Design a binder for this molecule. Sequence first.
Ligand SMILES: CC1=C(S[C@@H]2CN[C@H](C(=O)N(C)C)C2)C(C(=O)O)=N[C@H]1[C@H](C(=O)O)[C@@H](C)O
Ligand SMILES: [Zn+2]
Ligand SMILES: [Zn+2]
Length: 231
Amino acid sequence: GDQRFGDLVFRQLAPNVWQHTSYLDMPGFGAVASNGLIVRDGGRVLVVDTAWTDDQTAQILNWIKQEINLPVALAVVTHAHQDKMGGMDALHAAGIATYANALSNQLAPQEGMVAAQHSLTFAANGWVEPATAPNFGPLKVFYPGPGHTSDNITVGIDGTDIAFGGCLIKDSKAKSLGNLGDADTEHYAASARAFGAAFPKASMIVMSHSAPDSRAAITHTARMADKLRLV
Ligand SMILES: CC1=C(S[C@@H]2CN[C@H](C(=O)N(C)C)C2)C(C(=O)O)=N[C@H]1[C@H](C(=O)O)[C@@H](C)O
Ligand SMILES: [Zn+2]
Ligand SMILES: [Zn+2]
């Protein structure tokens, strides 16, 4: 079901949802996949996560313009690392309104990211304060607590069985939790379980670094995280 477009791969998940995949090329690293989402919300398109680079992100915009040809109303990025926020300048050059966790915007300069134009804040139960996420349509944004990073956020897509874990969630066969340099090893497992609880009807779990998985992804991530906590 994957389709190549330039150096990107797109996979349709639902009538109005596609996963975008881009691959990092510095000289020094493998071709590392990163996934995000494209959501058609009627007469506009919503983007979750940039690609690694501005150029790659501009390719995503060209795919959208060709294959959907509606205006991109907004992008939300799920934390301040390159694979999620590397393409902010391309979004801004295209005049797209960008949203991130307030904490992601505060971290951005230290991480080398361009901050999003707008800051999301969250209630104590983890749900985005809806004043800070105006006209998000089907995107249900949830901060599950610190895990992969302090600022990681997650997104459910209303009307579908899809929830997006970002880099918080790893696939049910993953051997490790990936990059833990910025991780909160005490709270990670609870944050993975909270994501599962926030979207209890989602049966397709989309994540940054593997194909869409079942809910087993969530329970396998929380286990690896608790193993890490107890060492
Ligand atoms: C580096 C990237 C990683 S670690 C990585 C992805 N899966 C890898 C792997 O070794 N597999 C065997 C699948 C290595 C992750 C991550 O594990 O979540 N994401 C990026 C970095 C990150 O998100 O922390 C970039 C954004 O700095
Ligand atoms: Zn990350
Ligand atoms: Zn990642």
